[PDB]
Structure formats: C-alpha cells, structure tokens
Amino acid sequence: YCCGRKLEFSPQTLCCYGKQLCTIPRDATYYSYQNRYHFCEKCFNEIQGESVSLGQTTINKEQFSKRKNDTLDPELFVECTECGRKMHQICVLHHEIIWPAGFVCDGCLKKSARTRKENKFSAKRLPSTRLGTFLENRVNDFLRRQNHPESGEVTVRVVHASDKTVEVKPGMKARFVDSGEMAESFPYRTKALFAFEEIDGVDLCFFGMHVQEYGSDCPPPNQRRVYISYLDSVHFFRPKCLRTAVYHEILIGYLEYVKKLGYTTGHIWACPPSEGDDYIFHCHPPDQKIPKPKRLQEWFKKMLDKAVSERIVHDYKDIFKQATEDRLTSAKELPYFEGDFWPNVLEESIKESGGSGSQKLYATMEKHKEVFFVIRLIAGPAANSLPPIVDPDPLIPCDLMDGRDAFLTLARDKHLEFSSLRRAQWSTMCMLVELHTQSQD
Ligand SMILES: COc1ccc(C2(C(=O)N3CS(=O)(=O)C[C@@H]3C(=O)Nc3cccc4[nH]ncc34)CCCC2)cc1
Numbered sequence: 001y002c003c004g005r006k007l008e009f010s011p012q013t014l015c016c017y018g019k020q021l022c023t024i025p026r027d028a029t030y031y032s033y034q035n036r037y038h039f040c041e042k043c044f045n046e047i048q049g050e051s052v053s054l055g056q057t058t059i060n061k062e063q064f065s066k067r068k069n070d071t072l073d074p075e076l077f078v079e080c081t082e083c084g085r086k087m088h089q090i091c092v093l094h095h096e097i098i099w100p101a102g103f104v105c106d107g108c109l110k111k112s113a114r115t116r117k118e119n120k121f122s123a124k125r126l127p128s129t130r131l132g133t134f135l136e137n138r139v140n141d142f143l144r145r146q147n148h149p150e151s152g153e154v155t156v157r158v159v160h161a162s163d164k165t166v167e168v169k170p171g172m173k174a175r176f177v178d179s180g181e182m183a184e185s186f187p188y189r190t191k192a193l194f195a196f197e198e199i200d201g202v203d204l205c206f207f208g209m210h211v212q213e214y215g216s217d218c219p220p221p222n223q224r225r226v227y228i229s230y231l232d233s234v235h236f237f238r239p240k241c242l243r244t245a246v247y248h249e250i251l252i253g254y255l256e257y258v259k260k261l262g263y264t265t266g267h268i269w270a271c272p273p274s275e276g277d278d279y280i281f282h283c284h285p286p287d288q289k290i291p292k293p294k295r296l297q298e299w300f301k302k303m304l305d306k307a308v309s310e311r312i313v314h315d316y317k318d319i320f321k322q323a324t325e326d327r328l329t330s331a332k333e334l335p336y337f338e339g340d341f342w343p344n345v346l347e348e349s350i351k352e353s354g355g356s357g358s359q360k361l362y363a364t365m366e367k368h369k370e371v372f373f374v375i376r377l378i379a380g381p382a383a384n385s386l387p388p389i390v391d392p393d394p395l396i397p398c399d400l401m402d403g404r405d406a407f408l409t410l411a412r413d414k415h416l417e418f419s420s421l422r423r424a425q426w427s428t429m430c431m432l433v434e435l436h437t438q439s440q441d
Pocket residue numbers: 231232233247270271272273276277278279280284288289290291295296299
C-alpha cells in the first residue's frame with residue numbers, strides 16, 4: 001500500500017421510512033426490504049400489525065432483513081502499468097476519463113523525465129459567467145491583500161441556471177389565490193455555484209450555494225428579491241485563519257452583484273441542517289460541526305455588518321422588525337419562496353385558525369425573528385425608478401445541479417466523500433469530470 005494505511009469508506013446513513021426526518025447512523029440496527037425501504041429498530045417495532053404499507057403495496061414484516069449499519073467498503077487500488085505498484089486510487093488521484101492511457105506512478109514518471117498530461121477537466125476550465133468572474137475576482141483580490149503564504153487560487157463557477165416557479169400550497173391557495181388576492185405561482189431563476197481552491201496543484205471544492213432569484217417580471221410580493229436556498233462547506237480551506245473571511249467574501253460579493261443588476265432585497269433563513277453528514281456535500285468531516293442556531297445567526301450578522309460598512313447593504317432587519325416598518329397586515333404580503341419556512345408554517349396557521357391568514361402572523365414572526373434576515377440592498381428613492389433586470393449570463397442546463405438532491409445521490413452512489421482532505425480532493429476531481437462530460441453532450 002502506498003501509505004502504510006488500511007483504508008475503508010464509512011457506512012452511509014439511511015432513513016426510518018416511517019417517521020419523516022428520522023435517520024439511521026453508523027452502527028445502528030435497522031430493517032430493510034429490497035435494499036430500498038429502511039426502518040430503524042424503534043420505528044419498526046412501533047408499527048402495529050405485520051402489514052407494512054410500502055410504495056401502495058403491503059409487505060409482511062418477516063420479509064424484512066434485520067441488520068446493523070456497519071458495512072465498510074474497502075478503498076480501491078490502481079496498479080501502475082510499468083512497475084506494478086498498487087496504490088489507493090484516492091491517494092494518487094487517478095481518473096480513467098482524465099488519463100485513459102492508464103495509471104503511471106510518479107516514480108516511473110520521474111525516471112523517464114516525464115509528467116502527467118494536463119488535466120483538462122479542471123475547475124478553471126469550467127465555462128465562465130459574469131457572476132462567477134465577479135465572485136472569484138473579489139475573493140482572490142481579498143486573498144492577496146492578506147499576504148498569507150498558504151493561500152491558493154480560488155475559482156468560482158456557476159454550474160446551473162434554469163427557470164422555475166414556486167407554487168402556492170393548498171392552504172394558502174384556497175385562502176388567497178382562489179379569491180384572486182395573490183398569484184398562484186412565482187417565476188424565478190435558480191442558480192448553483194461552487195468555489196474551489198488550488199491546493200498543491202489539485203482542486204478542492206470547499207463551498208457550495210444554491211439561490212432563488214425573482215426578477216422584475218415576478219408579481220409582488222416576490223419581485224426583485226433573491227433568496228438563498230442552502231449553503232454548505234468542506235472545512236479544509238488553506239489557510240484555516242482565512243476560511244470564515246472567504247465565505248463572507250463570497251456572500252458579500254453575491255449581494256453586491258445582484259444589487260448591481262437591480263435586485264432590491266436579499267433573504268436568508270438561518271437554518272442549520274439536521275444532525276448528520278449529508279447536506280450538499282456527502283459525508284462531511286467528522287470534526288466539522290453544524291453550528292447551533294445562535295452561533296450561525298452571529299455568523300450571518302458579522303457578514304452583513306461588513307457588507308453594511310462596505311456600503312453594499314443599506315441595512316438589514318429580522319422579519320418581525322421588517323414587517324412592522326412595512327406596516328404589513330396579511331400573510332399574502334410575505335415573500336413566498338421555494339422550500340422556505342414561511343410557506344410551511346402558513347399552511348399550519350390557516351389550518352389551526354380555521355381559515356385565517358393573519359391571526360397569529362405577528363406572534364409567529366416575533367417568535368422566530370432571530371432566524372430570518374431581510375437584507376435591503378437598494379433603499380430610498382433609488383429603488384423606485386429601476387430599469388428592468390437583465391441578466392447577462394445565459395441559462396445553464398445541468399440536471400445534476402438542479403437542487404441539491406441529485407449531486408448528493410451521485411456522491412452517495414459513487415463513494416464521493418468530503419470527510420478528509422484526500423477524499424475531498426478525489427471527490428472534487430470526480431465531480432468536475434461529471435460536470436465537464438454532462439456539458440459536452
Ligand atoms: C458559525 O459556524 C459556522 C460553520 C459553518 C458555516 C457555513 C456552513 O457551511 N454551514 C452552516 S449552515 O448554513 O446552517 C450549513 C453548513 C453546515 O453546517 N454544513 C455542515 C457542516 C458539518 C456537517 C454538516 N452536515 N451537513 C451539513 C453540514 C460555512 C459557509 C456557509 C455557512 C457557518 C457558520
């Protein structure tokens with residue numbers, strides 16, 4: 001073995017198909033059918049009756065297998081076509097698409113005064129966008145101002161852009177849409193972008209983001225607004241003392257960019273993911289922790305405070321303070337975003353109140369105010385006569401990056417973990433190959 005190390009992949013986590021938001025971690029005992037339908041021990045024995053409705057097909061309980069989530073797949077080896085040396089594929093970062101001729105180890109290459117032919121599936125060679133260019137220029141300019149000897153070049157790429165609509169859910173639809181008081185759906189553009197850092201001639205994907213952008217063609221209350229769907233990171237940015245600043249630089253640059261195009265407001269739901277290691281990146285490092293709510297909120301406040309002092313953000317408020325200043329009276333006046341908290345809670349509010357869309361609206365907003373940031377980018381009379389929003393970047397069809405589920409599934413299916421620096425670099429290389437090959441079609 002190249003290193004002296006016996007290496008295997010970790011058991012990926014599963015789901016109690018009974019209770020939503022239940023998960024089955026490493027070493028837990030569970031019940032599975034056809035390697036598809038998984039139940040944890042508690043959620044399985046808590047089923048009354050040996051009939052288990054699947055799909056919908058009813059399936060007997062003895063047709064399930066009792067097992068524990070402790071399977072460890074060994075890492076794969078590659079063989080040098082010249083010496084026969086066996087090395088972990090991840091250790092030497094050999095990808096058969098990038099180097100189809102075969103794996104030649106570094107030792108045989110140095111003996112023959114040879115080097116690997118260029119990796120043309122790099123982050124740098126992903127197609128550029130005006131947004132990506134703006135973001136990476138900001139980050140790299142910040143990084144060279146810091147003069148830290150360890151920092152590498154950062155490239156930012158938009159890897160998906162497509163048109164979508166968010167549909168008002170049945171409760172709010174019956175209250176406000178069927179009476180003609182509110183649009184049935186809101187058109188928006190979703191964008192997925194990632195940041196990579198060159199670490200010793202090797203790309204590392206360390207940051208990912210998906211956003212929802214509602215243009216000047218959107219009906220109120222959503223028009224000229226951007227909303228962050230989700231954020232994620234792999235904490236191996238070099239150097240560590242600049243990691244937080246770089247995240248902040250990307251986010252501030254994004255607000256600066258959409259402000260320039262004419263978007264008036266930004267929206268952030270400070271919402272930690274559920275415990276586990278899969279959000280956008282599969283299998284986070286074991287010592288990278290999900291922040292607790294208060295610390296995440298302070299993190300966003302720090303970022304926005306820097307944006308205010310840079311004269312990019314005019315000001316920001318919690319949703320409760322914001323609605324008070326806007327003199328809001330009805331739930332139909334709240335921006336309605338895909339997958340956001342407020343569409344969900346408004347469904348429950350209308351149900352519990354027997355059909356009201358304003359009853360406890362202010363109480364619910366105050367109860368949760370610290371979690372919802374409303375960021376004003378264009379204020380005062382400047383926001384009044386704005387020209388239409390024209391995005392200079394084209395659409396980018398890429399099914400793998402339409403939402404976060406597809407890339408997570410591809411990572412799970414192909415053992416692309418981001419749990420260590422070496423595995424994250426390998427997963428980055430594979431992810432780039434996928435993005436380069438799906439595009440050339
Ligand atoms: C104050 O400490 C922090 C630490 C990290 C962040 C950022 C971030 O990556 N955050 C906070 S998030 O927005 O709730 C989602 C994401 C996050 O927690 N990922 C994960 C880390 C570890 C295991 C995980 N499993 N699954 C997801 C996941 C870094 C850049 C974006 C914010 C912010 C504040």
